[PDB]
Amino acid sequence: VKLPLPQRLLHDWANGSWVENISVRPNGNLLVSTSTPDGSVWQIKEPWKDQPEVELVYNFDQWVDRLIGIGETTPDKYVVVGSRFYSTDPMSSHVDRTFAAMELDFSGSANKDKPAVRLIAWFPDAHLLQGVAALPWDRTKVLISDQYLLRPRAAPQKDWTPARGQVWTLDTVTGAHEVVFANDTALDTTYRHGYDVGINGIKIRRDWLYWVNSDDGNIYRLKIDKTGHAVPPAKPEVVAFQDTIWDDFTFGPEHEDTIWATGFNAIFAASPQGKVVTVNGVGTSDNGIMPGPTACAFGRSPHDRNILYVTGNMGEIPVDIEHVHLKGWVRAIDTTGFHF
Numbered sequence: 400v401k402l403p404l405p406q407r408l409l410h411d412w413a414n415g416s417w418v419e420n421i422s423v424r425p426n427g428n429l430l431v432s433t434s435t436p437d438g439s440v441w442q443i444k445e446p447w448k449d450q451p452e453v454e455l456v457y458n459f460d461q462w463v464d465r466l467i468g469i470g471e472t473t474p475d476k477y478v479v480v481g482s483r484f485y486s487t488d489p490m491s492s493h494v495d496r497t498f499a500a501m502e503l504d505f506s507g508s509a510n511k512d513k514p515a516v517r518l519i520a521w522f523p524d525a526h527l528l529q530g531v532a533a534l535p536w537d538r539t540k541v542l543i544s545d546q547y548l549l550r551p552r553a554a555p556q557k558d559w560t561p562a563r564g565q566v567w568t569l570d571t572v573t574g575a576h577e578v579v580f581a582n583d584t585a586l587d588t589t590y591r592h593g594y595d596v597g598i599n600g601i602k603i604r605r606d607w608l609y610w611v612n613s614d615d616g617n618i619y620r621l622k623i624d625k626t627g628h629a630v631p632p633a634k635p636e637v638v639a640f641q642d643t644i645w646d647d648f649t650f651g652p653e654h655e656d657t658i659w660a661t662g663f664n665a666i667f668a669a670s671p672q673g674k675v676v677t678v679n680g681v682g683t684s685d686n687g688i689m690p691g692p693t694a695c696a697f698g699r700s701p702h703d704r705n706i707l708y709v710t711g712n713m714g715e716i717p718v719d720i721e722h723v724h725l726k727g728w729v730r731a732i733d734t735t736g737f738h739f
């Protein structure tokens with residue numbers, strides 16, 4: 400019960416890189432998506448080792464300059480989303496109407512070390528695809544969060560009008576996709592936290608869509624039906640509050656309904672009743688050791704279920720968003736024995 404929790408560094412990428420999200424394979428290897436300097440998935444094999452192997456899986460340049468979110472669908476298949484971007488600068492806007500969803504298929508004899516990769520669907524009317532979460536009762540379908548600038552442009556960006564946030568469904572078998580939830584301020588930003596997004600990372604648990612909002616401090620959930628639409632009256636519910644810039648989160652370990660969420664240079668745990676504790680990073684004796692965490696996920700091997708693996712994209716604590724020093728990293732946090 401001593402805080403902060405124990406942590407160690409698995410791997411650093413080079414200056415300028417950005418590790419944006421993470422999915423754990425059934426065999427326990429990590430798959431991480433990068434936004435810069437290119438849009439790729441990397442694998443950390445056997446991440447419980449002191450010095451695990453880190454290998455490029457696939458660079459998605461054929462379709463996109465950057466990847467954002469990743470999520471597992473059916474076992475050992477993954478959906479990533481991405482688009483073209485005006486530049487590799489940390490402040491670069493996306494290029495409107497270039498978003499896409501792609502698949503990495505590790506399932507089956509032929510693919511379990513070299514995956515088969517394909518383009519699933521173009522999303523030219525989306526704004527910025529962000530987080531990906533499979534419907535647990537129908538795992539070939541995912542929800543995808545979507546929010547950022549309505550009018551992204553080449554630098555200097557001057558019109559920062561935000562698009563209203565929304566949630567898509569995507570059928571990875573047929574490629575069919577549509578918006579299933581939109582036009583609710585819980586999905587939106589008004590830049591209370593500076594330039595940012597509204598709805599960011601998503602996860603689905605039982606018949607609830609959960610998400611964090613990077614601008615209003617809230618973790619939300621929404622009751623959904625089996626096609627992903629909201630169950631009337633369709634009103635999001637606050638599950639927790641903390642005045643921090645949320646990015647992504649997970650439930651765990653194992654079957655526990657505790658939320659582990661990345662915040663502003665810090666990691667947080669939130670009880671289902673709304674109690675929020677800072678367990679790593681800024682606000683503990685960790686200080687600035689983990690700048691810019693972006694996502695987290697628990698280990699899946701029989702011998703690391705309590706290890707929370709954390710992706711990040713900064714090499715120093717930023718003074719302001721216009722002076723970011725990008726550097727991708729992955730750390731591992733030992734949550735063994737944590738309780739509220």
Ligand SMILES: *[C@@H]1O[C@H](CO)[C@@H](O[C@@H]2O[C@H](CO)[C@@H](O[C@@H]3O[C@H](CO[C@H]4O[C@H](CO[C@H]5O[C@H](CO)[C@@H](O)[C@H](O)[C@@H]5O[C@H]5O[C@H](CO)[C@@H](O)[C@H](O)[C@@H]5O)[C@@H](O)[C@H](O[C@H]5O[C@H](CO)[C@@H](O)[C@H](O)[C@@H]5O)[C@@H]4O)[C@@H](O)[C@H](O)[C@@H]3O)[C@H](O)[C@H]2NC(C)=O)[C@H](O)[C@H]1NC(C)=O
Nearest residue numbers: 495496523524525526549550562563565578579580581582
């Ligand atoms: C949540 O709520 C929203 C809001 O109600 C719902 O979205 C609307 O859905 C309806 C029904 O499907 C859409 O109506 C159709 O619109 C068609 C034309 O759409 C195209 O033009 C739109 C207007 O463009 C002008 O205004 C915008 C906003 O100010 C400017 O940015 C733009 O530059 C244009 O400005 C010029 O013209 C106006 C005059 O209109 C002048 O005042 C200006 O000075 C300029 O001269 C535009 O908003 C649309 O963009 C949106 O959608 C596209 C997808 O096509 C997407 O790629 C964009 O990123 C953006 O999201 C689009 O370019 C028309 O042909 C058709 O007959 C019908 O009228 C309506 O467009 C939607 N409105 C918005 C704001 O999105 C939404 O459905 C709902 N969600 C759910 C799940 O219910």
Ligand SMILES: *[C@@H]1O[C@H](CO)[C@@H](O[C@@H]2O[C@H](CO)[C@@H](O)[C@H](O)[C@H]2NC(C)=O)[C@H](O)[C@H]1NC(C)=O
Nearest residue numbers: 412413414415713714715716722723724725726
């Ligand atoms: C990666 O970026 C860091 C800064 O985030 C670089 O570190 C700086 O290096 C200069 C010149 O060597 C020093 O004057 C600064 O004091 C350093 N700042 C630090 C350490 O915070 C680092 O050199 C970069 N790496 C490479 C290979 O270029």
Ligand SMILES: C/C1=C/CC(C)(C)/C=C/C[C@]2(C)Oc3cc(O)c(=O)cc(C)c3C[C@H]2C[C@@H]1O
Nearest residue numbers: 489490594595644645646662663664691692720
């Ligand atoms: C990626 C992005 C891009 C949009 C743009 C171009 C305006 C950048 C803003 C930088 C910003 C505000 O920086 C943070 C910094 C950290 O230090 C940290 O620990 C945690 C978070 C969660 C964030 C998230 C991002 C916000 C947005 O999601």
Ligand SMILES: C=C1C(=O)C=C(O)C(=O)C=C1C
Nearest residue numbers: 419434465466467491547596
């Ligand atoms: C807003 C985003 C975001 O949230 C995350 C990303 O990975 C990224 O590459 C940058 C954009 C602009």
Ligand SMILES: [Ca+2]
Nearest residue numbers: 599600646647
């Ligand atoms: Ca994110």
